[PDB]
Amino acid sequence: GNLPGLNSVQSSHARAIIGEAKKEGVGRHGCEAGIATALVESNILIYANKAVPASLKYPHDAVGSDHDSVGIFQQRAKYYPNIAADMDPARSAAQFFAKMKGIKGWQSMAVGTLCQKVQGSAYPDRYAKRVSEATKICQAGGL
Ligand SMILES: [Zn+2]
Ligand SMILES: [Zn+2]
């Protein structure tokens, strides 16, 4: 059925993230970072943004108005110009994991801090508060 604490939509999205974690070989630690980030930024839903016209032309579970942030990871269109990718769970995850891997020391870095660095966020506390669930969800997905 569904993953721990996720409805069927969130579950679908998380499975796509977890699947890309396997493909990219980031292990549970990587998966924890991806899911924890997804929970904070969007609660694992695909957001569009009025501020980015092209994003309304892709399937989305809701609309938000944070900067030019789009998708599950709230990747800024400024920096991530391919909106198709930003609005696709698997491809958007690949974009997260790609940046995460370029961070020297990520494999043994605390998850909260790792998400902060990847997202350019100002506080790790938000992501850290979500790791317990991210683990449960990653485990249930096969990582
Ligand atoms: Zn870990
Ligand atoms: Zn700003």
Residue numbers in the entry: 85 to 227
Paper excerpt:
Attempts were made to crystallize the full-length enzymes from T. terrestris and P. virgatum. However, in both cases the enzyme was cleaved at the much longer (than in the GH24 family) linker between the domains. The crystals of the T. terrestris enzyme contained only the catalytic GH184 domain, which was closely similar to that from Kionochaeta sp. The P. virgatum crystal, in contrast, only contained the SH3-like CWBD, which was similar in fold to the GH24 CWBD. The full-length protein consists of an N-terminal CWBD followed by a catalytic domain. However, the CWBD was lost during crystallization, so the structure starts from Gly85 and only contains the catalytic domain. The fold is closely similar to that of KsGH184, with the largest differences in the loop region close to the active-site entrance: the r.m.s.d. is 1.8 Å for 204–213 equivalent Cα positions in TtGH184 (excluding residue 208), corresponding to residues 120–129 in Kionochaeta versus 0.75 Å for the full-length catalytic domains (superposed by SSM as incorporated in Coot; Krissinel & Henrick, 2004). There are two zinc ions from the crystallization medium, one coordinated by His132 (corresponding to the cadmium-coordinating His63 in KsGH184), Glu135 and two waters, and the other coordinated by His170 from three symmetry-related molecules and possibly water, or some unidentified compound from crystallization/protein production. Glu125 in TtGH184 corresponds to the catalytic Glu41 in KsGH184 (Glu45 in gp13), and Asp150 in TtGH184 (Asp66 in KsGH184) corresponds to Gln54 in gp13 that potentially stabilizes the ligand. The proposed flexibility of the linker explains the difficulty in obtaining crystals of the full-length protein and its apparent cleavage during crystallization experiments.
Muramidases are N-acetylmuramide glycanhydrolases which cleave the β-1,4-glycosidic bond between N-acetylmuramic acid (NAM) and N-acetylglucosamine (NAG) in the carbohydrate backbone of the bacterial cell-wall peptidoglycan. Here, the identification, characterization and X-ray structure of a novel fungal GH24 muramidase from Trichophaea saccata is first described, in which an SH3-like cell-wall-binding domain (CWBD) was identified by structure comparison in addition to its catalytic domain. A ‘domain-walking’ approach, searching for other sequences with a domain of unknown function appended to the CWBD, was then used to identify a group of fungal muramidases that also contain homologous SH3-like cell-wall-binding modules, the catalytic domains of which define a new GH family. The properties of some representative members of this family are described as well as X-ray structures of the independent catalytic and SH3-like domains of the Kionochaeta sp., Thermothielavioides terrestris and Penicillium virgatum enzymes.
